[PDB]
């Protein structure tokens, strides 16, 4: 006869986990949380800032069991990393909710490991949607909540009353490292995109529309005679970009992405910046007082991602990324005094295998390294020649 | 099928606003919140400590729109100031609830702008009623709540589940400027009195009963043989005061104001200190074990208010206040080295107009100043002579 | 038509009280809360760390009334002390709930006196059960909650929606003495045992099973081939102990106490460490993969409790404790330079009376001292002789 979050939590808690990390860049220990996304494969989502530069990562279930997990993907821009429990047995995954349907008045419960105390559940409400600005270079469209969140909670779950995952708790405005009623979480629709990508490739292939923009405030809207105090203001479209071909002109106000109204430029960025190259979307435009509807196809890009350090753990040097279909890892740009280039690693190389194993993309490459060989025999291709780079 | 504050908030949020201030006393910027009290006129309530000494104040709605607002009233003792949006178009006002019916177990949601992040809503419960003591010189009868409140929230709303305003969030007990679960808000019945007054005059005309008092604790109650551990203890009544005429004698315990029980002396003070001169009230007395009922009529006073600085913004000098009916602003007491007296401002003067505009009270006077003339031509009356004081 | 904790709180708040203490060890003042356990006798429970080393303790009801209270019991290991209001008139006691039925999703409201502001009520949920580790020497099986708790709250109540007491708020993880969303409370079943004991004897007579243990983590469980990631691991049983006689062998995993599953060793300890000598319990064992059920009878012990300082307030010296049935207070072990031994207090003595009053146990002894004589005439027995120790 007493209302309680107990029943829903009895089913959902096994899905959340605590993560222990051991790394070096100097030795360090870190701790946070993670959410089991796929029970069978043992995929566990979490903040990239928790497992970053980790030599060893161990996952601990709510029932006590400890497992070892290895990395599979990690996107610093959105701060979402995907690890995988080695030897997954009898896990429970969380079902994901559609974050686009969240409304500010909604209830929320957060689950995670504050200060290593163990699985802690605290509750509150959605205080705001679309918050961004914490770190202006990243993609951020944070859900804001007043459910208590402290250090240890990162990577943990943020669920609705029905037990569905709506976000991953990431950060907190807070002077003197102590929760104050203001916490942030990446919405779940982003986790579902960034994550599935990582599963199938090892990195996120970022697509761009090709427009330069800025937040459309009330002042700029007067100067530009537009009845709208919020939205994405198009500064200029790039030549031969998706937006160009679609018909978007500078001085345009983007007001909606796929039926959904667009809080601001930051969200629009985070939205498409989370979609995979080739996705078909439709933008809601506003040029010279008239409404407009256009169809776009996200295209390639020049996304700065996966550095030779995120896959080698310590091997400073050229950045790397997938190449076309599963054609292998490509070495983006080699620096100079960076250790990677100090082993024959030159920009333009295409790692097509390692230790007699084929490397179609970053995921597979990280698989060979997962076994931890004593000597890594890279089979790359420079121009029209096949060569071999050795390591230890 | 999920309970949520969303529906109520969809209607109420447009009513709350964020306030940006620019001032000097040295230049400064400040930010807080405000609540739209009257949609048509654009009246917006807020903490006096937010807009105080402000050269410029800008209001921003939840939809993005920005407007400029000018001051109309401000009472430092209760910490309630009333500003007005210039050119109000399509606003939503909040409906006010009767704060006297609040009970400690009640739910509350607070809306405001913590650290400029934007419209943030957080929730909790009424933790206590009648808190006072924060600043012993002011009038305080605070509602206490554990809904998260931080810097930026001042001037914001505190509403019940039905969306009705029960208070204005004002302050927070909190070491290291971070919410800790203890926040305070001026109840709404006070805002409704102090505010309506300001609208119609520019200041609050304070009425007094004319009694000296003190909190009636358990100890004093023994010494005085009174069965009551709480209430207002009458130390002495002033000669020719309302209380005197009504029949109140020293050694009396005031236990109720208009049917309503009286938490303490502080509340009693804050209660009547918020009512306008001439209001008809009835006090519940307790003299020598016997219950008593008396009828009073709040009378004049010697209220220290509106200084020549709150209307001139920087012109130190004599204090000012309305005079009788709309008879104009009266200059209370001129200091000495104060800039105001340094322009011919002498105590006893009665500003009856400014720049060829009639000044019936402080509101109108602040209207002429609102246009921001280059030279302010005061038409005051010293004794039986009409004179003119110039400014720039 | 609005849901509210008000109705339940109207009945329950009178039960909680604020406590003011004056002590010395140097003079000090302290403040906290307490819960009325028995209306008739005026028994009030509270944290031992609040009233410890107190020369004077005053209790203040929610209605204003102040009373003086004297101590009756106090257990530092569990941090529960029992005081008694002198001259109890018209009090309300709280009814206790069965804490073993609490589940993590459950709602909770906390009542107490943060920073002396007065009776404050804040709410939240059960974040976790069985937390321990705060102070590794004590008995701890804390309920964890995110209802706001700050200094002043210790000794206060933690109740469920029905108004029943489920715990006593004791401490908070919190950098910079400010609530952060993590608070702890001793569950009510412990308060009900530790407390009733104190009532009937002045101290808690601690019983032990006689086993050496440790938390059974996942690692130790592999090494020991046991399908269980949590429980109490038996390191060794003591000779002629209850556990010995019952049949418990080292290398055993205790997994349940009286039907109830056992979170960990810490809980198991806190559980039985709270039961009185002679209690009949049954343990759930797990030896060599096979389940086991055994019946035990808590036995004596060597519990380090009640020091000559907790009953004399300042008289350093030999520790003391009850003796057999109501046979009087026994002086455990006298130090050397300790003031107590500096008045003829030698270990082995059996205080059998004081100032012509019989002393059956520590409660009665503290009764004679309660009247505050000028000279305390102890009638103790050394060997086969009756002697008298004088004090002032």
Curated annotation (Swiss-Prot), chains A, B, C:
Which keywords label this protein? Cell inner membrane, Cell membrane, Disulfide bond, Hydrolase, Membrane, Protease, Repeat, Serine protease, Signal, Stress response
According to Swiss-Prot or TrEMBL, what is its membrane topology?
Peripheral membrane protein
Known EC number: 3.4.21.107
Please list the reactions this protein catalyses: Acts on substrates that are at least partially unfolded. The cleavage site P1 residue is normally between a pair of hydrophobic residues, such as Val-|-Val
Pinpoint the PDZ domain residues: 198-289, 295-384
Q: What happens when the gene is disrupted?
A: Decreased induction of Cpx two-component regulatory system. Increased accumulation of periplasmic accessory protein CpxP, increased accumulation and toxicity of overexpressed, misfolded periplasmic proteins. Increased resistance to hydroxyurea, probably due to decreased degradation of misfolded proteins which eventually leads to decreased OH radical formation.
Q: Which consequence is recorded for altering residue 179 to I?
A: Loss of proteolytic activity
Outline the inducing conditions.
By heat shock. Transcriptionally up-regulated by sigma-E factor and the Cpx two-component signal transduction pathway.
Q: Where in the cell is it found?
A: Cell inner membrane
Q: Which domain of life is it from?
A: Bacteria
Binding-site residues for substrate, renumbered to this chain? 22, 49, 79, 152-154, 170-174, 209-213
GO terms (molecular function) for this protein are: identical protein binding; peptidase activity; serine-type endopeptidase activity; serine-type peptidase activity
Q: Name one GO cellular component term.
A: plasma membrane
The GO biological-process annotations, alphabetized, read as: chaperone-mediated protein folding; protein folding; protein quality control for misfolded or incompletely synthesized proteins; proteolysis; response to heat; response to oxidative stress; response to temperature stimulus
Q: In the UniProt annotation, what is the result of changing residue 173 to N?
A: Loss of proteolytic activity
EC class name: hydrolase
What binding partners and quaternary form does the record give?
DegP can reversibly switch between different oligomeric forms that represent inactive (6-mer) and active (12- and 24-mer) protease states. Substrate binding triggers the conversion of the resting DegP trimer and hexamer into catalytically active 12- and 24-mers. The conversion of 6-mer (DegP6) into 12-mer (DegP12) or 24-mer (DegP24) is crucial in regulating protease activity.
Further facts: DegP is indispensable for bacterial survival at temperatures above 42 degrees Celsius, however is also able to digest its natural substrates in a reducing environment at temperatures as low as 20 degrees Celsius.
Q: Which family does the entry's similarity section mention?
A: Belongs to the peptidase S1C family.
Q: What is this protein called?
A: Periplasmic serine endoprotease DegP
Query: What gene makes this protein?
Result: degP
């Amino acid at each position: 006869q007493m209302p309680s979050l107990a029943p829903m939590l009895e089913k959902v808690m096994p899905s959340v986990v605590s993560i222990n990390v051991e790394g070096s860049t100097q030795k360090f220990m870190a701790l946070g949380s993670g959410v089991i996304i796929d029970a069978d494969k043992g995929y566990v989502v979490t903040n990239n800032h928790v497992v970053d530069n980790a030599t060893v990562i161990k996952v601990q279930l709510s029932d006590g069991r400890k497992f070892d997990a290895k990395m599979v993907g990690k996107d610093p821009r959105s701060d979402i990393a995907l690890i995988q429990i080695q030897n997954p047995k009898n896990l429970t995954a969380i079902k994901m909710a559609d974050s686009d349907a969240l409304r500010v008045g909604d209830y929320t419960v957060a689950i995670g490991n504050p200060f290593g105390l163990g699985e802690t559940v605290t509750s509150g409400i959605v205080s705001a949607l679309g918050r961004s600005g914490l770190n202006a270079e990243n993609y951020e469209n944070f859900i804001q909540t007043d459910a208590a969140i402290n250090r240890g909670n990162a990577g943990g779950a943020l669920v609705n009353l029905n037990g569905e995952l709506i976000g991953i708790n990431t950060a907190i405005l807070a002077p003197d490292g102590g929760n104050i009623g203001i916490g942030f979480a990446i919405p779940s629709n982003m986790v579902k995109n960034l994550t599935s990508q990582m599963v199938e490739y090892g990195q996120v292939k970022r697509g761009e529309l090709g427009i330069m923009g800025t937040e459309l405030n009330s002042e700029l809207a007067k100067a530009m005679k537009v009845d709208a105090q919020r939205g994405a203001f198009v500064s200029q479209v790039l030549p031969n970009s998706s937006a160009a071909k679609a018909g978007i002109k500078a001085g345009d106000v983007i007001t909606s992405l796929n039926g959904k109204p667009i809080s601001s430029f930051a969200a629009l960025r985070a939205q498409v910046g989370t979609m995979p190259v080739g996705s078909k979307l439709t933008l809601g435009l506003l040029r010279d007082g008239k409404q407009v509807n256009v169809n776009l196809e996200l295209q390639q890009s020049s996304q700065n991602q996966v550095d030779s350090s995120s896959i080698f753990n310590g091997i400073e040097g050229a950045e790397m990324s997938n190449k076309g279909k599963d054609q292998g890892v490509v070495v983006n740009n080699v620096k100079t005094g960076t250790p990677a280039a100090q082993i024959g690693l030159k920009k333009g190389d295409v790692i097509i295998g390692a230790n007699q194993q084929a490397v179609k993309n970053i995921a597979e490459l990280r698989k060979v390294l997962d076994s931890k060989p004593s000597v890594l025999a890279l089979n790359i291709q420079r121009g029209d020649s096949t060569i071999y780079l050795l390591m230890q």
